[PDB]
Write a protein that binds this ligand. Sequence first.
Ligand code: 1YY
Ligand code: S6P
Length: 585
Amino acid sequence: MPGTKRFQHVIETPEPGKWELSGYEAAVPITEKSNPLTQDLDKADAENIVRLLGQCDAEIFQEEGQSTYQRLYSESILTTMVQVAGKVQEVLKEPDGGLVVLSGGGTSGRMAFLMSVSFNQLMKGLGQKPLYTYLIAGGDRSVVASREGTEDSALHGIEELKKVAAGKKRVIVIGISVGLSAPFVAGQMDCCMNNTAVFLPVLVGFNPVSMARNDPIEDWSSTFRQVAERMQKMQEKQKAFVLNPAIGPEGLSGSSRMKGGSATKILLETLLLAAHKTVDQGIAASQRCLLEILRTFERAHQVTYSQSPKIATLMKSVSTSLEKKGHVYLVGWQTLGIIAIMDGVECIHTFGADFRDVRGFLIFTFSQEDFLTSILPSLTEIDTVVFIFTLDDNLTEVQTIVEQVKEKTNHIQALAHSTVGQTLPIPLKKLFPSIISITWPLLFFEYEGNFIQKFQRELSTKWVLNTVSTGAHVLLGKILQNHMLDLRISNSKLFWRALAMLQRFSGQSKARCIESLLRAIHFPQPLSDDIRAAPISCHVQVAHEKEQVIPIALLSLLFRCSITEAQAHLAAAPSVCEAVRSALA
Ligand SMILES: C[C@H]1COCCN1C[C@H]1CN(S(=O)(=O)c2cccs2)CCN1c1ccc([C@@](C)(O)C(F)(F)F)cc1
Ligand SMILES: O=P(O)(O)OC[C@@H](O)[C@@H](O)[C@H](O)[C@@H](O)CO
């Protein structure tokens, strides 16, 4: 029938009580799963939220139990990390005609950017030509923009790869897709297997290959799963690699910007840094060198979340500023500035928030005075302003801007990284009464710009900002249990996540859920056979432009009513959340 092909991969909705027994839950990719720890995230208070998300983040370092999926510390994974460092080494010995690409969509693309900068610095600091570069779905401007739609083309990913692999003789392509999902990466990886003489594909994500994405890609013949299954066979001959530990579900279901983006840096910084740090020693990469670095990243989480109460407080101030109708400014220096901007942008698609709601700033890339003349005047009693810096930064540029921001605002908490024994100038820096001081041990670093210190600090800032941006929105009641129900469908994965949320919350059949979603997307047009049979990209392109698609679809189903009736009910209610929750009662 019309649509049977498009929706063939959709598993039927199970009867109540058989969600486990039907085999449905076992087929939900780890990355999309409901994290049991956060079943009541929507009820947790600020302090609980910090705790629940700290716990979730800790899962990245949890070891493999006794049958079960491999994890970061499992020997299969560390062995693979070693073999990849090794391949990275061959290139590093032979920089002429060598390149190393880090590629991903969305937050994977953002992580790829940071890491390619860092390792480019490191080879500069040694006076070697930079061998690294990034590739992000939608070109360079996707780094600091919400552009969720650009990950859905495999030809675009291959094109970008073609641009950059120029007339190189030896290219390593690290395809990063947390969900082993993005069509952007799948075609990069497949292209690589078709020219092994030059390309070496390495795929990074956090699903087992048997849960890799398997619905058709509109511009490509193979699925991500097939691609990944074939790379896995190539790994026996060391011609492709898959690096895919389970780190457990996200605390907000499917929000791979969080653990996924964290585990991406942890995993790839660890392995790249081992590789460099051991080439110049005339030693192979070994599990032992990786381990040192992993354990440092694991200390970094303990260090970070020991500041929990102050993280919770900052969340309560971010949440208030937004509950009223203020704005939140995230102001930071060098790469923490960027991480800040990345965080604020992700809030647009993640929570349906305006670009002003949580915005990042680097010293998007504004000057001391420029920020002072331009942005400073727009501030107000109710806003929250966050400063994010090292004691190594230029604290005279820092102290100025806080001086000036104190005038027009008082909610100004801050996030300061220091190596132990450094002191915070102005002991009357009770400009910041209750700072977030993260103090780091002394570690032995033989490289120039202390990269392990950079990586620690970036990760810890990432975690604080992610937990804050995310907690602030849950407190406002925008999250339903641990699901973001009212997302904007802006790519095929989101379209599938929407369909899944409909099955999970209504309990009704696949055909009904699908019908209600398409009716909601295409209203006021009725369901035709063309619409039913359309590529998912047509549904996406229409939904992207609307509001409350998913909640309307769900109300239609719960009330067993039309779209006209569900839209009128939604308008009768005080809020979307209240409409939905009271309909769920
Ligand atoms: C639509 C459902 C059921 O049929 C198979 C597809 N399922 C959706 C899964 C996976 N999709 S995906 O195909 O884009 C993908 C595969 C691999 C990486 S992405 C994404 C969303 N999925 C999903 C999401 C949420 C659920 C929930 C909502 O049931 C819960 F979060 F609770 F698990 C279930 C499945
Ligand atoms: O790395 P993946 O699974 O290919 O996901 C790629 C992107 O969709 C993802 O990073 C998304 O932009 C974030 O908003 C998820 O919280």
